[model samples]
Target: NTPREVTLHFLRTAGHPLTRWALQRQPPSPKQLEEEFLKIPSNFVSPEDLDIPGHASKDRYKTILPNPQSRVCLGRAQSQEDGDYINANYIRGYDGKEKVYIATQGPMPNTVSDFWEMVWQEEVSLIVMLTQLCVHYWPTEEETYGPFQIRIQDMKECPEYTVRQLTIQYQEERRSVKHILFSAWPDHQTPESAGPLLRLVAEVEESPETAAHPGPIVVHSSAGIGRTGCFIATRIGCQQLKARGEVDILGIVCQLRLDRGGMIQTAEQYQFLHHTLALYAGQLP
Candidate 1:
């Protein structure tokens, strides 16, 4: 097929009722394009397939099994100096029933540990880490503490102490967790990775009852805004489409940008939103 014909077929098959701008990008003959478009099937594609591997042709949608040793001890740093702020905060607020979730850019710092202690003292059910690093922590007769390391990538292969500590916490609290720390770094900017990420968000949105009560779904990256905003917008948009039978894509994008500046920042990421919507609606070409 000619490039124009291929482009036209892709647009038609994509299943999204296209905007004028998207349509204008590909100029094709009406007769040939319409004939080919009519041959496409209409069926519900699994969200998992559509988001993770469909767009980028990469197998990133497989389930990540939980690891006993995955949990890390994110204890307080020895000193108050340097880039340990994030870690401290994580440790301090590690456990709290009232506000169930918080997102940090990197590892938990001393400030975070202090907050974690206050929360742990209150008997919160769970604490989830959203970084690309491995974490470890421990509880003492006086206080729970950790020297959480970012170098460890897989939660499943963490140190024995980390596993023991997490097991104790889980048994004492009588709660289950849905952890998603991976050993390999998936490229979020690519469609293959973006799809799985979106699927994860969808799963979380669909099953809030399974998580710690009152915890917000925490999202973070190196900057905690670009990727974070994309995640937030894609989630809200998809949910809105599912519930309302349609989404105001532009409006949602505008609102997100206004709230946090340049949400869905990259052009490709923004385009993925529409593609995701189409896939959710079983409209992908």
Candidate 2:
């Protein structure tokens, strides 16, 4: 099925409200939706599904956003002072020395700009934007410039061309980005979006420059705490279990929270683990 159709089907099954545009458009049948869903893996096991031992309660895992001005920070801290402006960094232990870093921005000061500057300086191989926006990248002899903005309507109309252009531009610039990752906030789930994102990652993986690069993906939201944490934790956990013979969920969560402060902060967020793992079942490791 087409990516857009798959996404719409996921939204319907997940019981999310459809946009006026979506409602007006022809919808897929239940049989088609079932086929698409079955095509995807189901390795995810929610926190509620597992008998998690010593899992911290919601109150205990809640995060307090730090003042951007303050140099000392917590929960995936990123800043010039912290030595890395992007809270998400490449964990190379799993595969090799290849790294992936993720940075997210909300309506906050110095977040996006700071992250862009860092990516340019670091010459990051690939970058993905997860906001409900269209991020632009302008490159000079030395750097890339962007004033990324959310253009949700444009995406709904022509996502493929938009993504294609982005990928082509990165390739033309020798930026080592073979794929682009976009998420649907009000409309979709990770499963719906994972196909495209993984396709892009595969492109990068196939490229000679990034062939040995570890495949830990970078994901983010505004706070880089909750959604970001859940996504990253799920990826990490799945990798550990499949690649390293590890299945200690609580142990892994503890290490993630301690290192980056509350990787999975809510019951719903924790539940995503099961779903994400299910998605990555045989594919991971």
Candidate 3:
């Protein structure tokens, strides 16, 4: 596994030997978590990390954004254009295989087309929408982007989420994709429970294509950080615990922020993550 995040805390001169020896190996208790939050260097992340050249602003979108270094590049086709960018990143999965996801911003009316283009070009098989965010316009039996046509074939809904099967015809080419819209997440808050979220992850991972090919599964909320980060972290955290018999929430969040700044945004969401995992871990027979 390619674990990462060599933070400034680890970059100090060797004179501070004790710092190097204090890598906590397991999940911290609630009290310890409060202390850990106090030390999280919030200043280390900035807008420069989310900027994309030729993008609308030198800065990232007012609310939606992505870290450039790990952002997903929608360049498989030869038809690149001005409206061809979205705030998005590739989040790592089990054993650090990044093919597991595309953590992206909710598409604006302008970027919806770019969204489909990424879905097609990236060979993304499944999309997990965290909020009613603009990520999906088929969220249509057919259409958006002026340049493409979407045809929905089937749909299903549960108390937690909805699903749709769609055929996106772009450039006269056709590709089918799964749309899993999790409408439960509100604008700037998290769900009251993580059970639905974990159940959805379990369903997605059950897909054989996800297991063998590892194409991107698009995930987003309004800004693609808070709720989005928690969802992806849960997926990754579940894997970490199963593989190593323990999980590192701090390391996982640090790794995520390194890829796309502002991950696991609030302490409440962060704490919710622990509660979710604790519940999940307890059920693992």
Top model number, lDDT: 3
**Across residues 1-285, which tens digit of lDDT does each residue of candidate 2 receive?**
985465335433442222222322422344543443343322222345333233222112123332122212222222223333333333222332234434333323334454444443445544444444323432312343342221121122234212321221232243333234455532123434444444433443443455454333334455555555555555555555566544333344443433333344454444445434444554643
The TM-score of candidate 3 is 0.81
**CA lDDT of each candidate?**
0.37, 0.38, 0.68
Local error of candidate 2 at residue 159 (angstroms): 9.0
Better of 1 and 3 by lDDT: 3
**What TM-score, computed on C-alpha atoms, does each candidate reach?**
0.44, 0.46, 0.81
lDDT, model 3, position 121:
76
Q: Which stretches of model 2 miss by more than 4 angstroms?
A: 1-100, 103-110, 132-174, 186-218, 244-246, 282-285
Please rank every candidate by lDDT, starting with the best: 3, 2, 1
Q: TM-score of predicted model 1? A: 0.44
1-285 per-residue lDDT for model 1 (tens digits):
885365334433343334433433432345534443343222112334322222221111222111112111223333242321121111111111222233333223323453343233333333333334222323322233332221222234332112111322312343323333322222346245445555555545544354334444344443333455455555665665555555555455444332322334455555666666555555322
For model 3, how does the per-residue alpha-carbon lDDT over 1-285 read when each residue is reduced to its tens digit?
A: 221233534222111111111222244566766766554544233545444566654123554456556777767373547544567888877666865788887777666767777887777878888874353466354565556677889898977888778777766677777877887677557786878878888877775483346578888877778888889988987887666656667767766765676777777777777777776776676
Model 1's C-alpha root-mean-square deviation from the true structure amounts to 16.3
